[PDB]
Structures are given as C-alpha cells and as structure tokens.
Design a binder for this molecule. Structure first.
Ligand SMILES: O=C([C@@H]1CCCNC1)N1CCCCC1
Ligand SMILES: O=C([C@H]1CCCNC1)N1CCCCC1
Ligand SMILES: O=C([C@H]1CCCNC1)N1CCCCC1
Length: 330
C-alpha cells in the first residue's frame, strides 16, 4: 500500500503545516500537524474542555462505529515550546492520503494548553518519531507509521514541505519526480527516540563551507532551524543590524535587510536554504524589526532541523530495520 496527502501552511509565515486525516466511520476529517519530533497522535475532541476549544474541528468517538475506548489508557505530553495536552485514548480507523490503519491509537484531548487553543487551524498532532516516545500509559502505543509499515510497499515516508506553498507527505514510496539530482542518505540514531542525524557542516551565503559535525533532529513539527550558538552567530554577523534580543526571545534583524542563504551538509552533499526562508517577519504588527528563522539551540539540549531547513529539501524518513534519513535538493 501507499498514501499521499497534501500538507498546507497554516499562515503566511509557514509557522506550521496541516494535513487532512480521516478518523472513524463514517470519516471525520481533522487537519493535523504531522510531527516527526513526537510520537502521539492526539486530537481535539468531544471530550476537550469546552473553554479550551476555539474553532478547531473535533473528533467525536461516539459518532464513530469503529471507535473503541482503550480502557484505562491515559496520555500526557509536554513539548519543547512549553505547550502541552492530555486525555484518554480510543482505537479507531485512521486514513492518510488513501492509506488506512485499523486499530490506531487516537489520543483524545481532555485538556490542551493555551497555544493549542489559540491556533484554530490545528486540530491535533500526528507523531512520526519513534514509538518509544509515545506517552500512552500503562500500555505504550505505536505511531501511525509504525502501524502502517508492514503493509507499505517500502518502509518509508517522505516530507516535501513548501515555502509559502503546499507540499506533500507520501507513505510507502519515493516520488522520483519530486526532487532533483540524487538522494544522499545519512545514518540515524534512535537512542533519544528522534530522527537524529549528524550534518557535516555549514556555509553562510557565498562563504566557504565549514566542515564540522552537527548532531540534530529532523523535526517537521518545529518551525525554525535551531543550531549551536557559534553557527548562529556566524550567520547573523553577515546581516547588518542583526542582534540577539532577550526581550524578543532570539535573533532579530532589520526588516530592510536582504538575508544571505544558509547551506547545511548531508555527507558530501549540500542543501541550500534561500535567505527568504529565514525571514519570519515583523516581531509585532507594523514593526521594522523582523524575527530570524535561524536561532540558537543553546538551552534546548539538542539541535533541531525544523521546517526552515526541511522545506529546502525532499526528505526521506527510512524506517527500515536500520533507519536512515535521505536528503535531496528540489
Ligand atoms: O517537543 C519537541 C518538539 C516540539 C515541536 C514539535 N516537534 C517536537 N521536542 C523536540 C526537540 C527537543 C525537545 C522535544
Ligand atoms: O519554542 C522553542 C523554544 C525556543 C526558544 C526557547 N524556548 C522555546 N522551540 C520550538 C520547539 C522545539 C524546541 C525549541
Ligand atoms: O515565535 C514567533 N514569534 C515570537 C518572536 C517574535 C515574532 C513572533
């Protein structure tokens, strides 16, 4: 089997991407944030505290003939931006882009934090990291990808995110029309439950490439590119007037600037992030200070190749027995 679904930015800055997902019988379509940095499929639901729902589409398990309470199971997750959610669990039929998993754990939110409530366009998350991070207790549950894997033509999924445009998540096949040149594969460590890999270095704009190992995760659920302070300082030093602002919470730059590109290494290959991809616009409406799309990972504890980096590439998440990651230009 295979699946193919379009993923669409939620706003003009590509702050996140949503992908339609069919849950239950008859289908209830919710728009989920596909997150290769976590491993819970959770949704706004008929059980979510009413005051915490503001425009989201909800899953109602009582209206699904295939829904079954997973008795005694609960979940609770805290994300790296300080957001959180928790609730109980149903199993139901879940389909993505034509690919169907029966008996998928669908985690029904009873509580969500304010940042979820405030984002009316995101109806929940679909985790695509390794199932060892799944928070369901007392019986840990598998991700949609892990459940689908054995049925897929090939044990892979791909992320092809757009810059200010829709893109695609494919399951079970590599679309050879969706990228240019060849795909470079690189080793993955699953020790922390993430798609964790080591970049071979970077360049700023037209500058020379610096060979240096940068361990980090491929995380479609993180908006920005978070890298070591040394690397980030070298980038922003090439932008007149850029500075790190503790009051704003990161690097800002004059909105009048033309940003340089940023290149990262994948083995001997190179992925170029155009300068425009690094512009996240005014810090507040009408401001002439703009927020940077490359930020320091210091204090996070891990480097994160988020959407700013991933959308510059066609990315293969290879879930073979020894997982790997592939990157191609596009
Ligand atoms: O919570 C997260 C991210 C949040 C955004 C969505 N992807 C998962 N983590 C990844 C980075 C290290 C801390 C854990
Ligand atoms: O929002 C944040 C951090 C970055 C700034 C310091 N506190 C919040 N991140 C995005 C999600 C993955 C971890 C990094
Ligand atoms: O994370 C987004 N923003 C916070 C920093 C200023 C711009 C908006």
């Amino acid at each position: 089997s295979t699946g193919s679904a379009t993923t669409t930015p939620i706003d003009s800055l590509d702050d996140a991407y949503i992908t339609p997902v069919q849950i239950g019988t008859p289908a209830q379509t919710l728009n989920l944030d596909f997150d290769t940095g976590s491993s819970d499929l959770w949704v706004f639901s008929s059980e979510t505290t009413a005051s915490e729902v503001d425009g989201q589409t909800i899953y109602t398990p009582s209206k699904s003939t295939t829904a079954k309470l997973l008795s005694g199971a609960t979940w609770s997750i805290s994300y790296g931006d300080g957001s959180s959610s928790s609730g109980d669990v149903y199993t139901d039929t879940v389909s993505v882009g034509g690919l169907t998993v029966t008996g998928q754990a669908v985690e029904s939110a009873k509580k969500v934090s304010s940042s979820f409530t405030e984002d009316s366009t995101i109806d929940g998350l679909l985790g695509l990291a390794f199932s060892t991070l799944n928070t369901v207790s007392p019986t840990q549950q598998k991700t949609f990808f892990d459940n689908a894997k054995a049925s897929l033509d090939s044990p892979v999924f791909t992320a092809d995110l757009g810059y200010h445009a829709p893109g695609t998540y494919n399951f079970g096949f590599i679309d050879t029309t969706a990228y240019t040149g060849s795909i470079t594969y690189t080793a993955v460590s699953t020790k922390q439950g993430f798609w964790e890999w080591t970049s071979t270095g970077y360049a700023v704009g037209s500058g020379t490439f610096k060979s240096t190992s940068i361990d980090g995760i491929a995380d479609t659920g993180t908006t920005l590119l978070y890298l070591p302070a040394t690397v980030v300082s070298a980038y922003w030093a090439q932008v007149s007037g850029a500075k790190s602002s503790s009051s704003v919470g990161g690097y800002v730059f004059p909105c009048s600037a033309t940003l340089p590109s940023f290149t990262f290494g994948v083995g001997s290959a190179r992925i170029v992030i155009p300068g425009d991809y690094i512009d996240f616009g005014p810090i507040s409406t009408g401001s002439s200070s703009c927020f940077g799309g490359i930020q320091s990972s210091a204090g996070i504890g891990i480097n994160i190749f988020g959407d700013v980096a991933l959308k510059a590439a066609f990315v293969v998440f290879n879930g073979a027995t020894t997982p790997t990651l592939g990157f191609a230009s596009k």
